[model samples]
Target: MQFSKMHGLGNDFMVVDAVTQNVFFSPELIRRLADRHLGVGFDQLLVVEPPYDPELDFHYRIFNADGSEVAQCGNGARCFARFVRLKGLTNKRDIRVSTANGRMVLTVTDDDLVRVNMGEPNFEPSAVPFRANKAEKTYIMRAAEQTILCGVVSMGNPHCVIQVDDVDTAAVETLGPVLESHERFPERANIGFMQVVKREHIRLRVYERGAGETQACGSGACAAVAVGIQQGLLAEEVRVELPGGRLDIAWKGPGHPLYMTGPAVHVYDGFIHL
Candidate 1:
């Protein structure tokens, strides 16, 4: 199979151009392909297919390293736009894509960064699948002996954002797995440990639900900023610094779409026998 390896802020993916190729990706095959030592390792596998919807430019699918198909992937989305354009699939700078969750717009900027309309942040507990009577500013969860206060937001995927004094020392390795499988989040969730440096800047670390602790997470960054803004601790725009790289996130408010801008890098391309 032919593929391109790409990364957006250090979150890597194995991109398959299924639009022009005939390939079948099963859960077991994806899991084998994602093995770090045995296969082309990636945080997620992005499959680019022909859009069934005429209005959409392409169909994007995200599969986690564990072989579980996911609804959305922010970092992968940016890489998707770059891959399609670089491959001469589209000439338009602005592309609309349909995913498992919904449709999204991807714009390739002159500076080479991809700006994605991540849709609106969903706070309704039912939408987030959070077990709660109503949406609150924050929910308290217990991890071992530590009490964690976190804000829940869904950016096509579920995320739990927690404020910390310092992201460097946050108990991500310890608390991440615990909260990811917490009963409150019925669908499990990505966990974000955020340290607000200023209204416009914040440091973050994310424990992805299926990918574990990744260097960067696109949706996680948006969720962090959304939680911060909703909590009245951040401005309309914020710079999120992650272990991999930085991402710019902007949101007007609750009912508005969140915009995320970041760079997507193409590593190398090769064919691997399956």
Candidate 2:
């Protein structure tokens, strides 16, 4: 199968254009494709299909490296926008695409960067599927021996944000797996450790569910900034720096949606016979 490798802030994906060719995927097949050494490695497998909605340009389906279909992926969306444009699928600067969560808007910027409107973050209890305190902006959660104040938000997928003094010293490697499988989050969650450098600058480290600790996570960054604004800890516009790169995050204010603008790059393209 032919595939293009791409990444947004170092969160990589294997993108396949289903419109140009067929990809017969099974759980095992996807797992093999995501193997770091055994096969083509990736954080997720992104599939581009013909748009179901006449108004939209295309549809996106995302699967974790584990082969589980996921609701949404912000980094993947940026990569998708770049891929579609590079493949001559669409030239519209701003394009709309549908995902499991809902429809999303994407804009291909100069220098191959893609900006995505990730839509409003869902804080309702049912939307977040967090059983603790009915999806409040912040909740006290206990993971292992650590007790932390966690902010939960659903950006298509569930995310748990924690503001700390230092990203390098945060116990993400220890508490991340514990909180990801914690009972409070029924569907599991991506864990983010963020440190506010200033009102407009922040640094973060993410232990992404199903993908472990990646270099970066776009949705997680948005969630962190959104919840931080809701708690009056940060301003609407913030610069979030991760291990991979930086993301420009903005929100209107409390009870408003978040916007993330960043760069997406193509690493290479190839075909793998499995």
Candidate 3:
């Protein structure tokens, strides 16, 4: 299989163009390809196919390394936009793509940056699939021995945001896995440990569900800023710095929705034999 490696702020993925190539695989094949040691390592396998909607130019599917399909991937979307444009799939500045999450609109800017309209942020318990008696902007949940107040939000996929005094001190390895698989989140969730640097700046480390700890998470960054705004701890427009890189996020109240802008880098391309 021919593949292109890409990353958005270090959240790397292997892009497979299904339009010009063929990938015949089973669940095992997906798992093997995602294996770090035995196969071509990647956080997610991005499949680019022909657009389902006649109006759109392309469609993309995100599958985690575990071979399970995810609702959406913010970092993956940025890389997808770069790949399509570099491959000459579409030269238009705006590209529409269908995902399991919904219709995503991508705008490719000059300087290899991609801005994604990640749709609306859903805080309802049913939408986030959190087993709660009442829905609120944030919730306190228990994982292992720690009781953390997590702000649950859905930017297509579910995310649990926790604010800490310091990102370095946050128990990323200890609490991240526990909270990601906690019973409260039905579909599981990406666990984010964040520290508010200022009203307009924040730092985070995310343990993405199925993907574990990554360099950066575009949707997680958006969720962190959105939750901070809801809690009155941060402004609507903020810069989120992750371990790998940074992302700019903005949300204009309830109906306005969230927008994320970041750079996408193409690493290299190669073929992997089964």
Best by TM-score: 1
- State, as a TM-score between 0 and 1, how close model 3 is to the true structure: 0.86
TM-score for candidate 2? 0.87
Q: Which one is best on lDDT? A: 1
Give the Å error, residue 149, model 1.
2.8
Residue 101, model 2: lDDT of 66
Clashes of 3: 0
Q: What are the runs in model 1 whose C-alpha is more than 4 Å off?
A: 66-68, 73-75
lDDT at 185 for candidate 1?
Answer: 85
Tens-place lDDT per residue, model 3, 199-244, is 9999999999887887877888988888888888898889899998
User: Cα miss at 42, model 2 (Å)?
Assistant: 2.1
State the lDDT of candidate 1 residue by residue for 126-171, as single tens digits. Answer: 9887888799998888877889899998887899999999998999
TM-score of each: 0.89, 0.87, 0.86
Which portions of model 3 miss their true places by more than 4 Å? 73-75, 141-147, 272-274
Model 2, span 114-201: residue lDDT tens: 7777778887767877886565767898766768898888887898999989999999988898988889888889999989998899
Q: Return whichever of 1 and 2 wins on lDDT.
A: 1
What lDDT does model 1 reach?
0.90
In order, the Cα lDDT scores of the candidates are 0.90, 0.85, 0.84
Clashing pairs in 2: none
**Residue 219 CA displacement from its true place in model 2, Å:** 1.7
